[PDB]
Amino acid sequence: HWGYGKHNGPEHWHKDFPIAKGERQSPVDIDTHTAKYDPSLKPLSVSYDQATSLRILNNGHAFNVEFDDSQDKAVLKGGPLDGTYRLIQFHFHWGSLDGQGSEHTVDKKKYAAELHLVHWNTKYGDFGKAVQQPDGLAVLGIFLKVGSAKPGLQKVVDVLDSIKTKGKSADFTNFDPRGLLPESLDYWTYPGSLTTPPLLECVTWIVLKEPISVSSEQVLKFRKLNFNGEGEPEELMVDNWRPAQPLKNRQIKASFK
Ligand SMILES: [Ru+3]
Ligand SMILES: [Zn+2]
């Protein structure tokens, strides 16, 4: 099935998922001189105080930290969003080298990695129904650069040993995603898609301008994960990013002047 290799990678996805060549695919290059400040954007509200993480899963393409979304706890609202979007999971995309790994780019610049916090619109009842709607999802995207360690990330880093291979999971309760945020909530926003198959075009993207810094030791531990299952030949989980896709017609709006 789909992956990131030569024979099953982003160039192949369109065969099983024709939407891969659709009208609002993600990620995209953010051309900072084409994006326009939007005065009609409300302040962004990231409310992760009561976030309830459950566990971490290696799903054979990345790792997901999953949250209890059966109540309004960790929510995203404001900005370009109408209503309330509930945090369901987060994950990353990263490279084999520091010079690549992000999915969104900024004036063609690739970051070492990218964090995606996935939320679904509570008006639709649950995730499965939300992903049938054009405004079903909101994803908060955060760039990672290599520098100082991110203390909020170390708990994630430490557990990766226990989920080396596809299908492994571990208990991951009481993780606070507030520790993964940069200082500023300045952002770019555009309508897009999920960046993995089935590449559903349900996402309001909110991509933060300020990257977080993580240590070389932290990203290196990401790169020790496996795409393969236990007892299979080792395939390092690296370069699990989709490249930039055609913007076509879409406008990227900036929250800042
Ligand atoms: Ru997979
Ligand atoms: Zn993602």
UniProtKB/Swiss-Prot annotation:
SMART domains: Carb_anhydrase (SM01057)
Pfam families xrefs: Carb_anhydrase
Site (described: Fine-tunes the proton-transfer properties of H-64): 4, 59, 64
Listed GO MF terms: arylesterase activity; carbonate dehydratase activity; cyanamide hydratase activity; zinc ion binding
Subcellular localization: Cytoplasm; Cell membrane
Annotated effect of mutating residue 194 to E/H/R: Strongly reduced CO(2) hydrase activity
Alpha-carbonic anhydrase domain mapped to chain residues: 1-256
Consequence the record notes for mutating residue 2 to A: Impaired activity, not rescued by 4-methylimidazole (4-MI)
UniProt-reported outcome of changing residue 196 to H: Higher affinity for bicarbonate. Enhanced proton transfer capacity
Enzyme class per UniProt: lyase
Amino acids binding Zn(2+): 91, 93, 116
Keywords for the protein's UniProt record, in alphabetical order: Acetylation, Cell membrane, Cytoplasm, Disease variant, Lyase, Membrane, Metal-binding, Osteopetrosis, Phosphoprotein, Zinc
Effect of pH on activity: Optimum pH is 6-8.
Effect after changing residue 59 to H: Reduced proton transfer
Active site, renumbered: 61
Effect caused by changing residue 59 to L: Reduced activity
Consequence the record notes for mutating residue 141 to R: In OPTB3; complete loss of activity
GO biological process: angiotensin-activated signaling pathway; carbon dioxide transport; morphogenesis of an epithelium; neuron cellular homeostasis; positive regulation of cellular pH reduction; positive regulation of dipeptide transmembrane transport; positive regulation of synaptic transmission, GABAergic; regulation of chloride transport
Binding site for substrate: 195-196
Cofactor binding: number and manner: Zinc. Can also use cobalt(II) with lower efficiency, but not copper(II), nickel(II) and manganese(II).
Disease involvement: Osteopetrosis, autosomal recessive 3: A rare genetic disease characterized by abnormally dense bone, due to defective resorption of immature bone. Osteopetrosis occurs in two forms: a severe autosomal recessive form occurring in utero, infancy, or childhood, and a benign autosomal dominant form occurring in adolescence or adulthood. Recessive osteopetrosis commonly manifests in early infancy with macrocephaly, feeding difficulties, evolving blindness and deafness, bone marrow failure, severe anemia, and hepatosplenomegaly.
PANTHER family the UniProt entry points to: CARBONIC ANHYDRASE, CARBONIC ANHYDRASE 2
Additional note from the record: Target of drugs used in treatments against glaucoma disorder and breast cancer.
Protein name: Carbonic anhydrase 2
Naturally occurring in which organism (per UniProt): Homo sapiens
Lineage of origin: Eukaryota, Metazoa, Chordata, Craniata, Vertebrata
Gene (UniProt): CA2
